[PDB]
Symmetry: C4
């Protein structure tokens, strides 16, 4: 009991040696409780024997020596080291920190088919129809603006919205906490996909509410794991995502002004002002190269060359970070 | 014999210590059979001595302690650790699991030249002619549609098909299991490369059977290891491959609608409907930028800028996974 | 005292053994000073006991054996090994080398708000206005060249420069070493952003001083960490950065000459000389593909194909080095 | 002497134990020669003591046990393990294998200035003029074809060739082995840069010898390390380099035929034949997108979309291998 008396721990032939005050620091563990560890004592050698994994005990003993630092060694498998922590009984408060450091009736029945579709057969069949109603609604939306086009795009627009409403209503009543119902951004999409039609019953407003009829494409996120992974990626990459927008903003203003002063004293110049040369810089840095406007002078072609070179660089800098973020959520979701 | 009696195993000076019940778990092995291991016993120290590799034995002893877990340590070479498993005689059922976890007359003679061309000299010379008959058949197919063009493209089309038939026939008779003949997708290609001509002896059909005269290019897979590696890559990447198609599908419908509502109240607008703006989104996200259609309004250029930015991102996310899959099959095929 | 007498050091059960002349090499350390280490001596075993980390001591003892080589083992955490060096008292001259090898009143008050804006609340509020004066100055600069345009772009140009001057003046007087004031390239930008206007109070000069009114965009580097990281990246990548320019220079002259001699005997040729075909090679290698000029002959299309293939290769060679350099400064700045 | 007698080797407290027949296998080494190792024997413990590196000896002892396998451990530094091999005296034949497995008067004076320019000051000054004569020769070559142009491009063409000849002549006489003079591909370039002019003192020949006046750009490889690294990269990447050309060849014929049969029954079709649609596939897969020809039909735009998608994939597969090959030669040349 905190007395500098020395204790020898033998792990499958690997000899460990520490003070009793070090093990008495955590009395709830195996080596810390004199009653739990005595089952492993060897009175012929004055040591405790364990017929278990050897590379793991380095961190187990150091967990006592450091006072709580539980770090898996770089050569010990994750499943093996985690099973050793449960044997020596380090505790759930210590096991949780190891996982954090490692990176880790009638109402309930109708709630399963309209939320967890893998719960049963008929629960997943509804997910098929809930997808067909999205694809048909997307198809009908694009075929409205066709130059060719009772009103045959109102039978479908209203048949695609009786599902969008009847399905949204059940999820609002079969839900437990109505106050935490709006935290899930996946149901605000279900609302923004019913706001336009139900409010259509100043020209700027009728146009924008027609735009909000394009967010329905996000309703596929409920039935697509890939869109979910994409959402978590951008949400965790806002720094390098906005960093790309900022590096473009500097490159646009820089190279739009550079091509303007090199293509300003020309009758055949296509750069009348700096803002007009903005789109040229964006399509040149992104290597899109529409061809709707291209420099003609010597200095204009020099700026155009450096605009394409600096474009592929300033874009490829924050891309691998976003790609690595995506591969994390994608490989983890298995 | 399962009796808690302790056993000391000395590996080139590294001392290991376990119970006899642990080694008696696998009596067919070296340390498990009392007759096999006694040749290594030292009665002066009461231990078994082995003058072999030291870093490997950590996993060898743990294979007994865990009950079958055979995992090579991260610092032991693959060839060295595999040669240790054969010494201690863990077994073929255990060696196979280690390889799985590590990622690993007259009829027969004519079958070698027309299947395994590296079997001999004349067997590989036929592979040269079997390639020249593919290149000439591909050349003749493209020169048919030339605006310039008994019928001189029937002498070659039929001379290139007497090989395609005579060679396909021998592979059908010199083959053992005729029932498993169609499992190899490499011979269905040999059939789809004879279906059109032999069936040409409703306008929609004559056109499509003319298309099926383009799958002959896949007959090069028999003589090209690179095409084989490409086939295994796509076959193992269907998830991220289709995930790219889906992320494009969302980006197309999203940005085609965005540019349409920004380029709809314009006499000089080139976006009459959403479907017409589909191709613009694909060539902009892929940075192809044909220039056949480009926005003119302010909001149209804003959507065009974000369409090129979101294009290089949503494409570069599943690409490294496909590239890594390709490097696996390519480096392994050595 | 340099006498070959042997010393046994026991680290938590791991036995180490060395000569006394090896530890007496560094008398200022723990194991080197007989008075410091005697507190850990065990007269029953004739050894020094330490109840500390075991994987770290390999390098600690080798620091004595090699004569100063202090290299952290590949399996020991950086924070753990650094805390061991301070226990054994290797010294600050040795700790500094370990960090290098690891990769690591009234005047003062007004100097905080105009240099270290995170010092207080009002110090950071000025950084907001110091950014708004940059954005408005950039906006006003681009709206000058608009084809539409007492003089309303002089009220803003002079209101944006009273801040650019009043703020630059305080940083010159609240600065300690006026001689080392110009070493910081971030203040030469503050000067080049006041040189044009204050000197406007040979046509080639009035034009270039109008260009120098575009370097103001760099004044955002004071309030943007991302621009700072970009500056350090290019400054540390000048080799592979200029290596890209050189590989392009070879590819331009190579493929411009190749397309010229293939598109010289043509009435409809768009390549009258080698220099005119320079811009075509740059936009083709960078995959920009404006379309302002494209080959027509067979050999011209062959050169164009190889120009696009060799373009994506010669560009993607020095890019990952620049990307890796960027990820270093970006992840380190946390 | 091959007698199973056991030998204990103590490395700084780490105990090793082997048979004498194992060490007697290599009598020329330290532990193998009884006269060399006796200087380290301890008659009080019957063991050989060494006050040296501990992680290295695992492979040193296994070099005897395996019979010649000398593999550095994954945790031992390269410089430390190499210095241990020289202490135990394993031999030069064994040290060379370790390096291979690790990846590793008047005539002589004039030969230094014209081959090894870093030998002295005046030797490197000539390299500056030898570069200026290349840049001027390249500049003069491109300014010949200018539409504006005793003959002022013969004074420079001949002044740039008196250096190209006088410098080539000295390297041929100040060279030792004239038979191995043509093995260095860097001097065949010096010959192909003198072949045209000296042979100009059938129209197809005068044109091609005018082309061979473009290989002079390769004379910069003598004064540019980057071009040397690029040469070694392509020379070691011919597999994945030609693999890219082959994957393009399949994609060209595949997608050129696909767009043709979808754009053949159209008065406004721009694809009259398969070969004419070749260039469209190359510029679409490489995302160049000139815009000189673009599909119009529905199926043509479908093929165009898949041609751009399959383009960025089939190109990005063998690129990282070429990039990794380049980073090897580039980082090694330091
Ligand atoms: K392009
Ligand atoms: K274009
Ligand atoms: K591009
Ligand atoms: K383009
Ligand atoms: K165009
Ligand atoms: K055009």
């Amino acid at each position: 009991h905190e007395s500098s008396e020395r204790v020898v721990i033998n792990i499958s032939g690997l000899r460990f040696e520490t003070q009793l005050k070090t093990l008495a620091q955590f009395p709830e563990t195996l080596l810390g409780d004199p009653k739990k560890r005595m089952r492993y004592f060897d009175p012929l050698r004055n040591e405790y024997f364990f017929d278990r994994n050897r590379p793991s005990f380095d961190a187990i003993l150091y967990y006592y020596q450091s006072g709580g630092r539980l770090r898996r060694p770089v050569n010990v498998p994750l499943d093996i080291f985690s099973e050793e922590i449960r044997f020596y009984e380090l505790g759930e408060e210590a096991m949780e920190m190891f996982r954090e450091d490692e990176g880790y009736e009638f109402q309930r029945q109708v709630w399963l088919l309209f939320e967890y579709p893998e719960s049963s057969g008929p629960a997943r069949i509804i997910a098929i129809v809930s997808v067909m109603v999205i694809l048909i609604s997307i198809v009908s939306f694009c075929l409205e603006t066709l130059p060719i086009f009772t009103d045959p795009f109102f039978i479908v627009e209203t048949l695609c919205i009786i599902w969008f409403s009847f399905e949204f209503l059940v999820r609002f009543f079969a839900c437990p906490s109505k106050a935490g119902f709006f935290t899930n951004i996946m149901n605000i999409i279900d609302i923004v996909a019913i706001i336009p039609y139900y409010v259509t019953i100043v020209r700027r407003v009728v146009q924008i509410f027609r735009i909000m009829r394009i967010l329905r494409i996000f309703k596929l996120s409920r039935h697509s794991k890939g869109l979910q992974i994409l959402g978590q990626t951008l949400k965790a990459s806002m720094r390098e995502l906005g960093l790309l927008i900022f590096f473009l903003f500097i490159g646009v203003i820089l190279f739009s002004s550079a091509v303007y002063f090199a293509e300003a004293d020309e009758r055949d110049s296509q750069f009348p002002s700096i803002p007009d040369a903005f789109f040229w810089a964006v399509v040149t840095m992104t290597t899109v190269g529409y061809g709707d406007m291209v420099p003609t002078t010597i200095g204009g072609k020099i700026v155009g060359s450096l605009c394409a070179i600096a474009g592929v660089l300033t874009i490829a800098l924050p891309v691998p970070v976003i790609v690595s973020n995506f591969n994390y959520f994608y490989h983890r979701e298995t």
